[PDB]
Structures are given as structure tokens and as C-alpha cells.
């Protein structure tokens, strides 16, 4: 119990259901460990994506509390604007009272219009929360609604069901062996240090180490462009004049397990994981994009990675636990 079931949309997005207001208005939101804010479309929104998604109506809630505090948030793939407000939020079988969240005014782009989810529930550290809004999880812990100051995440594969986020707890059943604890190098995103990225003992990228974040909100395993370029060349992934990274669907069954070394423990990612096989047309699972930070060039370990291991986010001792998916 205390779990939040998540749907798997084409192994590209994982979202669960939450209720807001009294009585509850439901919305589907990505449980994004790559950010810290909670927001959903509202009757005040004017963007396209809002014409076809659930919209929060403050007047239908006997518990809502308005504010005139507006904010604008920008992510790696998009941005949004809104107004903050307070209400009770139903998530993971818990009743999160006095939770601040955003009622969107805009959220441009076709991506959102075609997206199968309504909003975003940020699971990262408060320091990266727009206008310092109290993140849902910090609110759960502050009001004693969770047994332990941590949460676990399991992401299904091959469009399967069963995906879930366990709030305030860890569940053995979802993993084999024991959890390897990794210290958080920088508190904001769930950041850790990547020792090395090497296949066949050969350092293909991130030499001498690099910074990385664990983000459920990202689908692919991205890394700085200059480095990813090699990655493609080192696996046989080529680009066509259509954009997509075309690569042999055969390579899957004959390539080396690219291994991410974290705190002295190797985490192998077979080409049967970093290769996106939709049809008889296969594509790479790596994406080039420079994400500059004061901590350097960031690498994002998305679902392509999380899918392989049950990940525990421990806010009690600031650590990330990892172990192969059961």
C-alpha cells in the first residue's frame, strides 16, 4: 500500500493518477524525478494542449485556496506558465493536504496536445522547485503521511503494466539481490557521479568521470552531444535524412553491453536495452543534447536505464539505491 500505479505508454512515458480538490478532480501526471513542481491544466489555460486534457476548476473545490503568485517553468522539452494555489492532493493512497501546485495558463506545443497525460508531479529536491514551492514529497514527509523519507520506482518494459512508485517505502518483490547505495553528489536533481562509460573495458565517453541525474521524466539515455556522437559510431547507429537514429535491428543480438560504472559497481546496459525496437526498424536509445550546469556537462539516465533497475530515492540520507529489476 502507499503505492501509485503508473501506466506505460509505448515505453516512453509513465504516469499515474491523482485527485485534486474536494471532491477530487482527477488528472494524470508524470512522476518526474527530474523536477520538483506539481502542476496541472486549469480553466484559466489557453493553449492547444489544454483544449483536450483535464482542467482543474478551483470553483468546484470547497478546499481550494488561491494566490496571485504566477510562475513560469521551463524544462528540457517544454515550458509552462501558471498561478499557484493550494488544495488537497490524493496520491499513492495518501491524502496530501495544504499542497501548493500550479494551475496552468499556457503550455504550448503539439507534444502536450498529443501527450496522454495532464500534468507533472516533480519528485526532485526543493532547491530546484520554481518559486521555492513546497514539493509534494517534502509535504508528505512534513505532515507525517509517509513511514520513511524515501520512495521506490519500478518501470515496466515492452509496454507492460505493473509500473509503480512506492511512496515512503521499498518492496523486495520488485528486485533481486541487494540494493547498492550511491551517494548523491549534488542536491537538486537526483544527481550522482558516473565513474565511467565503457564497453569491452574501453572508455567510450565520460572520461575521468562525469555528473549524471536519474530522471523518470526522460525516456532516453542522453549525454553531451560531442560524446554521444562517438556512442552512435561505436554501436553502428547512423542517422538518416528523417532525423531518427537508424541502426541494424540485428546489432541487438551481437553488440557489447555498454556498462555504466557507478561508485565502483558496474551497471551493464545491453543493446537489448539501449536499442529501441519498434518494428523491424530499430533506433538508438542514446540522445545528444548538452545540458550545461555549474557541475559540468550532465548525463541523463532516463527510462532506458531505470527500466533495468528498481531505483530507490532516499531523502533521509540523500542516496540512490539500485538493483536489477525482478
Amino acid at each position: 500500500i502507499g503505492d501509485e500505479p503508473l501506466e506505460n505508454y509505448l515505453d516512453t512515458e509513465y504516469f499515474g493518477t491523482i485527485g485534486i480538490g474536494t471532491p477530487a478532480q482527477d488528472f494524470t501526471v508524470i512522476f518526474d524525478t527530474g523536477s520538483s513542481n506539481l502542476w496541472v491544466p486549469s480553466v484559466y489555460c489557453s493553449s492547444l494542449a489544454c483544449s483536450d486534457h483535464n482542467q482543474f476548476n478551483p470553483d468546484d473545490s470547497s478546499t481550494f485556496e488561491a494566490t496571485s503568485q504566477e510562475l513560469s517553468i521551463t524544462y528540457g522539452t517544454g515550458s509552462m506558465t501558471g498561478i499557484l494555489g493550494y488544495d488537497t492532493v490524493q496520491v499513492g493512497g495518501i491524502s496530501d493536504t495544504n499542497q501548493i501546485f500550479g494551475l496552468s495558463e499556457t503550455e504550448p506545443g503539439s507534444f502536450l496536445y498529443y501527450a496522454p497525460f495532464d500534468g507533472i508531479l516533480g519528485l526532485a529536491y526543493p532547491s530546484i522547485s520554481a518559486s521555492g514551492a513546497t514539493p509534494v514529497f517534502d509535504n508528505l514527509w512534513d505532515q507525517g503521511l509517509v513511514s520513511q523519507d524515501l520512495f521506490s520506482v519500478y518501470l515496466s518494459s515492452n509496454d507492460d503494466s505493473g509500473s509503480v512508485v512506492l511512496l515512503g517505502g521499498i518492496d523486495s518483490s520488485y528486485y533481486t539481490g541487494s540494493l547498492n547505495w550511491v551517494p548523491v553528489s549534488v542536491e537538486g536533481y537526483w544527481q550522482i557521479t558516473l565513474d565511467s562509460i565503457t564497453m569491452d573495458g574501453e572508455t567510450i565517453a565520460c572520461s575521468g568521470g562525469c555528473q549524471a541525474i536519474v530522471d523518470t521524466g526522460t525516456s532516453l539515455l542522453t549525454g553531451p552531444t560531442s560524446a554521444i556522437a562517438n556512442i552512435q559510431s561505436d554501436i553502428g547507429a547512423s542517422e538518416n535524412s528523417d532525423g531518427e537514429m537508424v541502426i541494424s535491428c540485428s546489432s541487438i543480438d551481437s553488440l557489447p553491453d555498454i556498462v555504466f560504472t557507478i561508485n565502483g559497481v558496474q551497471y551493464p546496459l545491453s543493446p537489448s536495452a539501449y536499442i529501441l525496437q519498434d518494428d523491424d526498424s530499430c533506433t538508438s536509445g542514446f540522445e545528444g543534447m548538452d545540458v550545461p550546469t555549474s557541475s559540468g556537462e550532465l548525463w541523463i539516465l532516463g527510462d532506458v536505464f531505470i527500466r533495468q533497475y528498481y531505483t530507490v530515492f532516499d531523502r533521509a540520507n540523500n542516496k540512490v539505491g539500485l538493483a536489477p529489476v525482478a
Partner: protein, 138 residues
């Protein structure tokens, strides 16, 4: 992934042990003639929130030590600017110079161009998220 934000007040203001917090950032410490006033405002907020369920400033009545109710706040990763103050790791560092401001405008300019690209893809010699302003680090 979160990259940046900008927002306008009225920012939540709270006083604990004489320390003023705005947007959860240490804004200033109260001394002498404002210690009681601070306690008073803290009690006011409690009443507005828990009883009247009113968050507007008309109930709240935040005093001047809460900073201008119309100031801006920008959030970068591991770095933020509230009003004229710079905060690294949620800690006051100094007041923004005209150089720091210029750096903020530049950043806003690049983030604007980047979001345009991001939310309109049907990157190919494209744009990457801009780097955080220099003041955000040492």
C-alpha cells in the same frame, strides 16, 4: 528535466526565530524593534491559513521586512535570484551588480530561443539549453 523558472510575488513570507524567510530563502534577520512585529506577522499568517483559509496579502499583511511584494525570482539549478539578492545553495552571497543583471537578461534571451525550438519539433544543428549565468558559481 527542470532547467529554469521565473515568477512574481507575493512570495510566502515566514519568520522563525527572528529569521525572515521569503520563498524559503533566508532574506534577513530581525533585531530589536522588529522581533515582536515578526512574531506578530507569523501569528497572523497562521490565522489566515489555518482558520480563514485566506492567502491573499489583505489577510496576511506582510510587513516591509518581507521585501517588495512585486519583486521577481529566477531559479537556475543550484542557484537563484530573488529581488536584488543572489543566493547560491540557498545562501545569501551578495546583491546583484549590473553585470549580474545583464547576465540574467542574456540567459532569459537564450532560454526564450531554446523553448521555441523545443515545443515546435515535428536537433540538427540546433540549440542546447543555455549555460547558467556566471554568478551562479564562484
Amino acid at each position: 528535466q527542470f532547467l529554469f523558472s521565473m515568477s512574481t510575488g507575493p512570495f510566502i513570507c515566514t519568520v522563525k526565530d527572528n529569521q525572515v524567510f521569503v520563498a524559503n530563502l533566508p532574506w534577513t534577520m530581525l533585531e530589536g524593534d522588529d522581533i515582536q512585529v515578526g512574531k506578530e506577522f507569523a501569528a497572523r499568517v497562521e490565522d489566515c491559513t489555518n482558520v480563514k483559509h485566506d492567502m491573499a496579502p489583505t489577510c496576511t499583511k506582510p510587513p516591509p521586512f518581507c521585501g517588495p511584494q512585486d519583486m521577481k525570482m529566477f531559479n537556475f539549478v543550484g542557484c537563484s535570484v530573488l529581488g536584488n539578492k543572489l543566493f547560491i545553495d540557498q545562501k545569501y552571497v551578495r546583491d546583484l551588480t549590473a553585470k549580474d543583471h545583464a547576465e540574467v537578461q542574456t540567459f532569459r534571451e537564450k532560454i526564450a530561443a531554446f523553448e521555441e525550438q523545443q515545443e515546435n519539433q515535428p536537433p540538427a544543428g540546433g540549440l542546447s539549453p543555455p549555460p547558467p549565468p556566471s554568478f551562479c558559481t564562484v
